[PDB]
Structure 1
Amino acid sequence: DTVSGLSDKKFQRPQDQYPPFRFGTVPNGSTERNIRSNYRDMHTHMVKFNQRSVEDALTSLKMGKLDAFIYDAAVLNYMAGKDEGCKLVTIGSGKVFATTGYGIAMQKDSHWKRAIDLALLQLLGDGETQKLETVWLSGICQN
């Protein structure tokens, strides 16, 4: 917990102290656009560490070429769970920033939207989604 916050001065000010913080993210995604539209300095620094192949970013973090990785919370929790060194998210619950969800994309003004929305809500209501979470996104040292 060296950072303790996405809006920390270490990230908002890359040149505040110590040699430049080596943090980056996978480009062409929602995270990159969010960072570009919100924190210009963050995005301009992140261009240097244009990571790829999130597994490769993870192994670069393990070796020591990187000290912070900005990415999706749902996949970062899973990657922390099945970790031999048990890497940790910044805050205990990760302090998820810009909370959103995974959705099923559809064509604009389609017909299937209402039925699929109701079916997804039914699946969430009956606890099938919790069963899928237990059977697919469990972690070793997450508990």
Structure 2
Amino acid sequence: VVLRVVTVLEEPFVMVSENVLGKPKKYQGFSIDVLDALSNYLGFNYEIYVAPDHKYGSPQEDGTWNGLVGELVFKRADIGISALTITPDRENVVDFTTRYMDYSVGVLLRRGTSIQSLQDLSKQTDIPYGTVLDSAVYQHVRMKGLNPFERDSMYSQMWRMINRSNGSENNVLESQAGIQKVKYGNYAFVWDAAVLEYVAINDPDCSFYTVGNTVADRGYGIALQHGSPYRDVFSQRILELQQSGDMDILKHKWWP
């Protein structure tokens, strides 16, 4: 029994280890190890392909979904292995396992800063900051900073910085671009805290520092087709990995 796995590249969750003839051959990462834990225990083999648009998946004008979620809806893949945020929107078109990673937001800073939190970052302007355009972080700051019900001045000030020149000045098109901008410029990059911790830990110049708060009731899960016969056993195994302390060994392999 061979499963077809769709993924989205995101260090250190899913990283392409080897390319042959212009296509990835081997994948590694925390999400890959969780997949390898499921495959060996439940007794299935798999093959992995990257989502063509490199997107996670969001609803479109016409109802259809794009990205990884779209690949599962159109049944072009059986399961999705990535840092895919569990949302009610997505739970309506694909089946999610239980959470295997906690959602977290953080900021990447040049070595030698006073910034301790996202709160601090919002209260200064000397270090410009931003994220990836139209990403999760971006859309959250935009929503909170434009919501008349919200009166947390942090999201209002952050959106003011992020949306300078309609977002062309302080944002980037890829996370790699944001990281290099911190490395070689005066900039702070807001992203998933777990990603940024991996980046900081592994930078050859050790030029980064990172702070971030985790977010409860938010996290990443494995996705499957709607009405998949594999969800329940997938979710059970994830619990088992958690109780046995196997998940904390995987997390320590990538976040020592």
> Structure 1 length as normaliser, TM-score?
0.71
Distance between the aligned counterparts of 1:105 and 1:60, measured in 2?
33
Question: Could you say which residue in structure 1 is the equivalent of 2:170?
Answer: 49
- Going by fraction, where is helix more abundant, 1 or 2? 1
Q: Does 1:11 align with 2:129?
A: no
Question: Could you say which residue in structure 2 is the equivalent of 1:26?
Answer: 132
Distance between the aligned counterparts of 2:194 and 2:175, measured in 1?
13
Q: Which has the larger radius of gyration?
A: 2
Over aligned residue pairs, what C-alpha RMSD do you find?
2.6
Aligned length: 127
Describe the shift of the 1:36–1:97 C-alpha distance in structure 2 as closer, same or farther (beyond 3 A).
farther
Contact kept, 8 Å, 2:129 with 2:190, in 1: the verdict is yes
Where structure 1 has 5 or more consecutive residues not aligned to the other structure, the ranges are none
Where structure 2 has 5 or more consecutive residues not aligned to the other structure, the ranges are 1-112, 147-155
Describe the shift of the 1:44–1:107 C-alpha distance in structure 2 as closer, same or farther (beyond 3 A).
farther
Letter matched to residue 45 of structure 1 = M
Q: Does 1:120 align with 2:230?
A: no
Letter matched to residue 129 of structure 1 = M
Report sequence identity in percent: 25
Large movers: runs of 4+ above 6 Å? none
Distance between the aligned counterparts of 1:4 and 1:51, measured in 2?
23
Residue 111 of structure 1 deviates from its aligned partner by 4.6
Describe the shift of the 1:6–1:109 C-alpha distance in structure 2 as closer, same or farther (beyond 3 A).
farther
Letter matched to residue 11 of structure 1 = S
What CA deviation, in whole Å up to 9, does each residue of 1:44-103 have, x standing for no partner? 43123121332222121111242x11100110110111022241113xxx3x15343221
Q: Which moved more, 1:76-85 or 1:102-111?
A: 102-111
Describe the shift of the 1:55–1:78 C-alpha distance in structure 2 as closer, same or farther (beyond 3 A).
same
Counterpart secondary structure, 1:105: strand
Contact kept, 8 Å, 1:12 with 1:39, in 2: the verdict is no
- Going by fraction, where is strand more abundant, 1 or 2? 2
Letter matched to residue 3 of structure 1 = I
